[PDB]
């Protein structure tokens, strides 16, 4: 029974495994190219999105600096440097919205 | 043209007695700039290992069974050969490091590079690796022949971070190009 | 011959997989405003869905208006937590 | 979103668990009816029409059957083991994609999640067998521990070869990657090895050593009875189906095809179920075709035949991937 | 609430619902010989709580280390695009040193119970 | 007048509850004690796998999914083998009979207080946080740092085989010595 | 805070152990758990992937130590026949 | 606020304080995620210099560029509202068909190539704006200009042609 | 009976294939990787197969001085 | 922190603070002037502040108790509902956005 001969099954296995590796070369090469398109599309959007985010950060920073000079009278310097540091902590009201 | 900047990465200065050519020289350069003594010493060093195990056998026989000494020579042969090549490599790269007399290496480096610079080719070649992976590789292998006794490592990356200002190479090539143009006029 | 009564439990197993795939798809399509749901989402996609709620009120809502509606610059959510920093 | 989040998650879990529990009932019926056909028998054909209520006669009988607490047994552990095995076997169905992202949890580390819940369920078998203080239950529990040492590296090493192609660990992305080609074509040896290790993972013949009835009496579950016994069968057959889903996820393109969304979702569910049902057949086919192996022979087979081949592939496969510029991007895309 | 948390809730309550039904609706008549250990019909020495010989403990010792080794390869399979050739080399050195230890296990016949 | 600072409840996209971390904390401590006080060695190795489980669920819930799943994967096999050795080297019945005195309580109180008090200032503010006006952590979004977010396992892979490859070579030599040594001291002679 | 509680359990479970040497090898495991767990929480608060890498290398040596410990116990038990620490 | 992803967030904090009269005012972009991805290649076809100028400004003020590059940011927003209006005055059916397709397809470009080709042609013949992806391999056809998509759940009709500018039909 | 490798390397390879196939072919498969690494990339470049350029995983910041742009200024709003 | 490799594949948050401190040390300290490294004292405090947040937690704490006590004393007329905060910035909810801003 040659359905169970070791050689033709070894042959058909080598063919299937070589064909599927060919299809895998083409697939991953195509996906790495699709990944390049997804990243360039993201990159064009990054400067308009980050610009809106920075306007929000400058606006919230300026407000908290104004709120402290009222509540605490003067501003407290957390950092010696002049660099903006995104806040780890924020003043919150004692109650959420009543809903 | 002039790259307008010749030291781009912060390097470590080591006190040494000779000029530093390359803190991370490529594998091929170490083999090419090897003196013929380096092949003499590294071949003598590789033979020392199995010859030591032979002499111990003659004076003080181990009393091992029929095939053991032949097995042990194969290990002593490899270990000697492995340490012989590491010794052969260290002799050539210490000259690149300025930790051994290197006048000959300094002059062949100042010619090979000024030949690449007048040809427009990159000084240290082109990497297939990314410029950050090139840096991780420079950082991993610079001065790494000084740890050869413990962990070995070789530079197989064509990076551009070798610890030396490249201005001298561009200066000589342009002066060599300056002399070439004047000589070509009288024709 | 073919023992079709042997293949009946296998047909039920296949069918209940079909029940699962069809129902998960329908419920998610409703939850996502009669739109196909999103999968394999990263920080950018989650930030983009939260920007969509800012303009439309629904995380999956889409508007093409070149100008933002008034109050968009004050509606940027800053997440408030108690312990996981 | 549109309606309540809790109600969505409520319906989403029901649509997975309840249909999967119905599926577990009929893999037992299908096994008995399929082994019988290969044995020139019929199988269940009387409890219900064509014997389609037989799994529930069995299930209802045991939950109404008396339980025994052995005097020598550690009773709190005698009940804890089967509960651990059942809970963690069923937990694996929470990462199964029935479509792109159609899972109760589209986790980015779903493959490692499954390795963690399968390993816990095995520890329940070890605990329950030892807790009986009977000798056949004790001999069976040691066999389960030997078997996990044998098949855990085999599966995890085999899976790591799939990840080297998909680059994800997410079950949806590995199915999406197979749109290029099913992974059973380039990874034909890995599919065989992973399937063999999955039969050993399930305690299924020819690797049925912990529960062997020709050598032990019932192995680890000999002293266990009633609903404690129900737990170990529900764990075993849900573990079988789950391993056939995973093998279809990792090598057979998962849900890929060989009101408007419902047609698409149904076709995805049918395609995965059709491929899963073929592998469920191969399990039952393997049980009716071979004798049992000795447990030392299984440990030798996994450690001197399978593992040497797998580590050789772990070296070889990324070397082919780099050689052809075929390393997958590890970013979110598919 | 998330589907994952609700999923854990249900599978637990199914484990309870089945267990509760049997604990309520099944007969319970525990007596001496019913509560005894099975030993195929004859009582024997209780020895399951005494030190027992495991002839495959050297396989458990090796499994722990190899489990650690394949875990140290999973980050590589999910980071191949960035690792490239330079990272592949180190991962090959790591596998190569580990394989030598496995060759020691095979050559010394540690995994060959007789 | 004008509030200008508005607190609100997040309807969707909200995170877990930090109540669950305190539950896992007590259970992990509870299970840790029961590992050493238990008379039965198998009951204490079961409390051991439990103890590793609440720590892993603690790590998963704070977003450490890889190391949390990897901890669980590694230790379930490790506890199984440790189970396997208790059944080979320990008389279970005589160990349960074996007891423990109460003479260790005075040392427990003294050693517990001194070390814990001394080891408290050795820990930083980030850990001692959340020990009637409390603080709230605030987070916002970025676009440049979110272009291609990696998973934590990918971030470790980005550096584990290049920037820190020395730790891998040394780690592979500890594992090699363990593979050769554990076998050398326990191998049956041949 | 839990890191300190766990470390104290492992330190007393190792020192005030009057049961068996396998429990002492478990207590070492508990201590390494607590030390690793402190490094993990700190890594998250400082945005450091190195402390997760550090925690991973503690896990691999923690298992290597438990293999050498279990291997040395087998050697000791083979000759002594008991791995029970004993107090008169 | 921190760039860390929250694990236990249950509350949102909002500030109703407006930016001071000193800083000029820019009306924000009103497009959603699907319209922005459908017009991203057009953003960069026109706004690349400003998109690149705002990023080089921030790199020239390390740690402080949020506050010190507010004008470059106002410029990028204006450049991006210009293309959006342009894609709306013209090619509005094509633009809607593309980004409405993208929302139903996980925002994956390869799943909406026929709508992209139709829009890309209409943007090209009314805005001289071309989709350009840098460093694509020269050995093979660009992936976005490929008839067959291997990862697309639905095969691309044979009669739908990719848009290559210049060459006629 | 079994051949010694150093006595006759070609005989040992035939015996190992036939009598110890799983171990022998593990070494062949594992060795095939370094053979692939050393031979395929040269042949790939010989036939013109070009390794692709890396995809950007950070904003590509251009080099050189800023371009001194004039457009989309504040006065262009209305 | 000081490594430069953060959780998302991007760089660590306290890496700029660390690179500035090392830059300050190498560019001010030397054997000729041992006391040039006192220039690094504020730079080294910023690195610890980026890491543990003790100074910022103290600032917010004082500001938050001050803020809340003024809120109680402040005159209250009508509180916005939760649904009204949700309506801010929407397509056709101009009435609610105005109420949120007291305009
Ligand atoms: C897979 C095997 C396919 C061939 C078997 C078909 C068959 O009739 O078997 C008996 C047939 C001999 O005919 P017979 O036994 O005289 O039966 C005559 C009946 O009248 C034959 O009539 P029937 O009542 O069997 O119905 C005929 C027809 C109609 O059956 C259906 O349409 C039912 C299909 C399933 C519905 C649910 O079914 C088919 O022939 C379709 C192919 C089999 C479908 C899947 C079976 C599992 O062939 C065999 O001897 C079976 C050989 C099996 C080889 C197995 C290995 C194959 C390669 C791997
Ligand atoms: C088993 C033994 C396997 C040995 C190597 C198998 C064949 C590798 C491919 C080949 O033909 O090598 C030459 C081939 C020459 O290519 P080419 O285009 O003619 O020249 C390009 C230029 O070199 C400039 O190159 P580039 O800058 O354009 O690109 C950089 C370079 C990127 O390649 C690298 O940077 C490779 C990294 C070299 C690290 C050196 C470490 C030495 C110390 C080892 C410490 C052992 C601790 C114990 O890219 C390549 O050339 C690709 C190389 C192929 C993929 C990388 C992996 C191959 C090496 C695997 C080593 C580990 C094997 C298992 C060890 C088990 C130990 C128990 O590639 C190399 O230069 C790699 C040499 C690797 C030597 C490894 C150490 C030997 C001592
Ligand atoms: C998923 C498949 C669900 C449908 C299959 C089971 C449906 C019930 C089958 C049934 O026989 O119920 C009728 C049952 C009778 O089932 P039954 O068990 O008496 O069937 C025995 C008859 N023979 C032997 C021919 C099979 O009647 C009711 O109780 C109602
Ligand atoms: C449902 C409503 C309640 C019905 C049961 C009422 C009495 C049951 C009874 O006497 O059962 C006796 C016997 C057992 O009675 P038992 O008193 O021996 O049960 C012992 C268990 N405790 C101590 C907790 C009471 O019941 C059965 O075995 C059959 C139960 C009914 C099965 C019907 C299908 C269930 C699905
Ligand atoms: C051939 O002439 O007809 C088909 C033949 C039937 O048998 P017969 O005619 O006797 O063959 C004589 C061969 N000398 O039978 C054959 O020759 C067929 C033999 C197999 C052909 C390829 C089978 C598919 C490809 C291999 C699949 C994968 C195999 C490995 C995986 C499984 C491992 C467990
Ligand atoms: C278990 C897993 C390990 C065992 C694997 C066994 C199977 C054997 C195959 C191994 C891998 C072979 C991969 C297939 C090679 C391949 O596809 O080469 C393609 C490549 C370039 O060809 P390409 O540009 O893709 O052609 C496009 C046509 N439109 O061609 C080349 O550049 C060179 C081709 C010759 C070499
Ligand atoms: C699930 C159902 C199927 C289960 C099969 C169980 C078979 C089994 O356990 O056999 C054990 C047996 C032990 O055989 P052993 O003593 O090692 O050597 C005998 C030499 N006459 O071992 C064997 O008989 C060896 C069986 C090998 C199967 C391994 C998987 C093979 C996958 C395809 C080949 C990939 C590996 C080689 C690749 C290169 C081939 C040139
Ligand atoms: C060249 C041939 C290599 C394989 C040799 C072989 O078939 O086994 C040799 C031997 C087992 O047979 P042996 O015990 O020697 O029988 C006669 C008694 N003197 O085995 C031994 O003595 C050594 C035991 C291990 C031999 C290697 C087995 C495979 C190693 C793990 C996988 C390797 C692949 C991955 C790494 C890449 C390798 C390049
Ligand atoms: O735990 C959930 C976790 C999945 O992680 P993630 O999806 O990020 O968080 C979901 C939070 N509901 O899931 C995991 O990854 C961990 C596995 C699930 C948690 C344990 C489930 C069993 C708990 C009860 C055991 C009773 C004995």
PDB file of C-alpha atoms in Angstrom, chain D residues 142-264:
ATOM      1  CA  UNK D 142       2.152  11.024  40.402  1.00  0.00           C
ATOM      2  CA  UNK D 143       1.547  10.045  36.738  1.00  0.00           C
ATOM      3  CA  UNK D 144      -0.167  13.436  36.117  1.00  0.00           C
ATOM      4  CA  UNK D 145       2.919  15.254  37.486  1.00  0.00           C
ATOM      5  CA  UNK D 146       5.268  13.176  35.272  1.00  0.00           C
ATOM      6  CA  UNK D 147       3.013  13.914  32.276  1.00  0.00           C
ATOM      7  CA  UNK D 148       3.119  17.745  32.774  1.00  0.00           C
ATOM      8  CA  UNK D 149       6.941  17.613  33.035  1.00  0.00           C
ATOM      9  CA  UNK D 150       6.712  15.755  29.669  1.00  0.00           C
ATOM     10  CA  UNK D 151       4.215  17.965  27.733  1.00  0.00           C
ATOM     11  CA  UNK D 152       4.524  21.518  29.151  1.00  0.00           C
ATOM     12  CA  UNK D 153       7.850  22.319  27.526  1.00  0.00           C
ATOM     13  CA  UNK D 154       6.695  20.563  24.355  1.00  0.00           C
ATOM     14  CA  UNK D 155       3.662  22.826  23.997  1.00  0.00           C
ATOM     15  CA  UNK D 156       5.341  26.056  25.108  1.00  0.00           C
ATOM     16  CA  UNK D 157       8.364  25.460  22.872  1.00  0.00           C
ATOM     17  CA  UNK D 158       6.051  24.571  19.976  1.00  0.00           C
ATOM     18  CA  UNK D 159       3.921  27.682  20.545  1.00  0.00           C
ATOM     19  CA  UNK D 160       7.022  29.894  20.622  1.00  0.00           C
ATOM     20  CA  UNK D 161       7.727  28.829  17.037  1.00  0.00           C
ATOM     21  CA  UNK D 162       4.298  30.140  16.025  1.00  0.00           C
ATOM     22  CA  UNK D 163       4.975  33.443  17.808  1.00  0.00           C
ATOM     23  CA  UNK D 164       8.275  33.802  15.893  1.00  0.00           C
ATOM     24  CA  UNK D 165       6.098  34.058  12.723  1.00  0.00           C
ATOM     25  CA  UNK D 166       3.069  36.067  14.048  1.00  0.00           C
ATOM     26  CA  UNK D 167       5.130  38.333  16.383  1.00  0.00           C
ATOM     27  CA  UNK D 168       2.073  38.920  18.578  1.00  0.00           C
ATOM     28  CA  UNK D 169       1.028  36.495  21.439  1.00  0.00           C
ATOM     29  CA  UNK D 170      -2.507  37.804  20.680  1.00  0.00           C
ATOM     30  CA  UNK D 171      -4.809  35.014  19.390  1.00  0.00           C
ATOM     31  CA  UNK D 172      -6.663  37.340  16.895  1.00  0.00           C
ATOM     32  CA  UNK D 173      -3.355  38.585  15.329  1.00  0.00           C
ATOM     33  CA  UNK D 174      -2.082  34.996  14.802  1.00  0.00           C
ATOM     34  CA  UNK D 175      -5.313  34.160  12.898  1.00  0.00           C
ATOM     35  CA  UNK D 176      -5.025  37.448  10.940  1.00  0.00           C
ATOM     36  CA  UNK D 177      -1.382  36.555  10.060  1.00  0.00           C
ATOM     37  CA  UNK D 178      -2.565  33.196   8.557  1.00  0.00           C
ATOM     38  CA  UNK D 179      -4.461  35.124   5.810  1.00  0.00           C
ATOM     39  CA  UNK D 180      -1.041  34.864   4.065  1.00  0.00           C
ATOM     40  CA  UNK D 181      -0.918  31.076   4.557  1.00  0.00           C
ATOM     41  CA  UNK D 182      -2.162  28.655   7.236  1.00  0.00           C
ATOM     42  CA  UNK D 183       0.748  27.920   9.660  1.00  0.00           C
ATOM     43  CA  UNK D 184       0.293  24.124   9.151  1.00  0.00           C
ATOM     44  CA  UNK D 185       1.986  24.536   5.777  1.00  0.00           C
ATOM     45  CA  UNK D 186       5.348  26.125   6.761  1.00  0.00           C
ATOM     46  CA  UNK D 187       5.262  24.581  10.257  1.00  0.00           C
ATOM     47  CA  UNK D 188       4.125  21.075   9.290  1.00  0.00           C
ATOM     48  CA  UNK D 189       6.467  19.320  11.875  1.00  0.00           C
ATOM     49  CA  UNK D 190       5.448  21.819  14.566  1.00  0.00           C
ATOM     50  CA  UNK D 191       1.764  21.097  13.914  1.00  0.00           C
ATOM     51  CA  UNK D 192       2.390  17.337  14.393  1.00  0.00           C
ATOM     52  CA  UNK D 193       4.422  17.894  17.542  1.00  0.00           C
ATOM     53  CA  UNK D 194       1.930  20.382  18.971  1.00  0.00           C
ATOM     54  CA  UNK D 195      -0.958  18.004  18.292  1.00  0.00           C
ATOM     55  CA  UNK D 196       0.892  15.101  19.934  1.00  0.00           C
ATOM     56  CA  UNK D 197       1.660  17.238  22.979  1.00  0.00           C
ATOM     57  CA  UNK D 198      -1.969  18.347  23.154  1.00  0.00           C
ATOM     58  CA  UNK D 199      -3.165  14.722  23.394  1.00  0.00           C
ATOM     59  CA  UNK D 200      -0.617  14.245  26.256  1.00  0.00           C
ATOM     60  CA  UNK D 201      -1.787  17.598  27.751  1.00  0.00           C
ATOM     61  CA  UNK D 202      -5.365  16.286  27.814  1.00  0.00           C
ATOM     62  CA  UNK D 203      -4.585  12.892  29.474  1.00  0.00           C
ATOM     63  CA  UNK D 204      -6.072  11.304  26.324  1.00  0.00           C
ATOM     64  CA  UNK D 205      -5.132   7.925  24.829  1.00  0.00           C
ATOM     65  CA  UNK D 206      -2.433   6.883  23.915  1.00  0.00           C
ATOM     66  CA  UNK D 207      -1.237   9.042  26.881  1.00  0.00           C
ATOM     67  CA  UNK D 208      -4.103   8.182  29.356  1.00  0.00           C
ATOM     68  CA  UNK D 209      -1.823   7.287  32.324  1.00  0.00           C
ATOM     69  CA  UNK D 210      -3.223   9.268  35.302  1.00  0.00           C
ATOM     70  CA  UNK D 211      -6.732   7.796  34.722  1.00  0.00           C
ATOM     71  CA  UNK D 212      -5.662   4.434  33.124  1.00  0.00           C
ATOM     72  CA  UNK D 213      -8.322   1.758  33.857  1.00  0.00           C
ATOM     73  CA  UNK D 214      -6.317  -1.253  32.658  1.00  0.00           C
ATOM     74  CA  UNK D 215      -3.469  -0.468  35.090  1.00  0.00           C
ATOM     75  CA  UNK D 216      -5.012   1.722  37.760  1.00  0.00           C
ATOM     76  CA  UNK D 217      -8.702   1.312  38.601  1.00  0.00           C
ATOM     77  CA  UNK D 218      -9.681   4.949  37.821  1.00  0.00           C
ATOM     78  CA  UNK D 219      -6.329   6.530  38.763  1.00  0.00           C
ATOM     79  CA  UNK D 220      -6.534   9.945  40.489  1.00  0.00           C
ATOM     80  CA  UNK D 221     -10.386  10.005  40.409  1.00  0.00           C
ATOM     81  CA  UNK D 222     -11.038   6.474  41.850  1.00  0.00           C
ATOM     82  CA  UNK D 223     -12.189   7.745  45.301  1.00  0.00           C
ATOM     83  CA  UNK D 224     -14.048  10.690  43.646  1.00  0.00           C
ATOM     84  CA  UNK D 225     -17.795  10.283  42.936  1.00  0.00           C
ATOM     85  CA  UNK D 226     -21.017  12.218  42.058  1.00  0.00           C
ATOM     86  CA  UNK D 227     -20.437  15.946  41.162  1.00  0.00           C
ATOM     87  CA  UNK D 228     -16.674  15.769  42.023  1.00  0.00           C
ATOM     88  CA  UNK D 229     -16.502  13.182  39.183  1.00  0.00           C
ATOM     89  CA  UNK D 230     -18.654  15.458  36.951  1.00  0.00           C
ATOM     90  CA  UNK D 231     -16.012  18.190  37.437  1.00  0.00           C
ATOM     91  CA  UNK D 232     -13.113  16.030  36.205  1.00  0.00           C
ATOM     92  CA  UNK D 233     -15.007  15.002  33.004  1.00  0.00           C
ATOM     93  CA  UNK D 234     -16.174  18.537  32.295  1.00  0.00           C
ATOM     94  CA  UNK D 235     -12.565  19.636  32.780  1.00  0.00           C
ATOM     95  CA  UNK D 236     -11.241  16.836  30.505  1.00  0.00           C
ATOM     96  CA  UNK D 237     -13.622  17.388  27.575  1.00  0.00           C
ATOM     97  CA  UNK D 238     -13.592  21.162  27.825  1.00  0.00           C
ATOM     98  CA  UNK D 239      -9.797  20.835  27.848  1.00  0.00           C
ATOM     99  CA  UNK D 240     -10.002  18.584  24.702  1.00  0.00           C
ATOM    100  CA  UNK D 241     -12.222  21.046  22.819  1.00  0.00           C
ATOM    101  CA  UNK D 242     -10.102  23.998  23.934  1.00  0.00           C
ATOM    102  CA  UNK D 243      -6.918  22.321  22.688  1.00  0.00           C
ATOM    103  CA  UNK D 244      -8.612  21.615  19.351  1.00  0.00           C
ATOM    104  CA  UNK D 245      -9.634  25.273  19.114  1.00  0.00           C
ATOM    105  CA  UNK D 246      -6.083  26.366  19.942  1.00  0.00           C
ATOM    106  CA  UNK D 247      -4.564  23.984  17.397  1.00  0.00           C
ATOM    107  CA  UNK D 248      -6.995  25.438  14.860  1.00  0.00           C
ATOM    108  CA  UNK D 249      -6.104  28.974  15.974  1.00  0.00           C
ATOM    109  CA  UNK D 250      -2.351  28.357  15.675  1.00  0.00           C
ATOM    110  CA  UNK D 251      -2.121  26.206  12.527  1.00  0.00           C
ATOM    111  CA  UNK D 252      -5.478  26.087  10.682  1.00  0.00           C
ATOM    112  CA  UNK D 253      -6.195  29.799  10.341  1.00  0.00           C
ATOM    113  CA  UNK D 254      -8.698  29.870  13.206  1.00  0.00           C
ATOM    114  CA  UNK D 255     -11.964  31.373  11.953  1.00  0.00           C
ATOM    115  CA  UNK D 256     -10.678  32.018   8.416  1.00  0.00           C
ATOM    116  CA  UNK D 257     -12.935  30.742   5.656  1.00  0.00           C
ATOM    117  CA  UNK D 258     -11.911  27.749   3.560  1.00  0.00           C
ATOM    118  CA  UNK D 259     -28.484  41.144  10.099  1.00  0.00           C
ATOM    119  CA  UNK D 260     -25.533  42.082   7.894  1.00  0.00           C
ATOM    120  CA  UNK D 261     -22.873  41.319  10.563  1.00  0.00           C
ATOM    121  CA  UNK D 262     -24.734  38.195  11.709  1.00  0.00           C
ATOM    122  CA  UNK D 263     -24.097  36.438   8.392  1.00  0.00           C
ATOM    123  CA  UNK D 264     -20.405  37.312   8.653  1.00  0.00           C
TER     124      UNK D 264
END
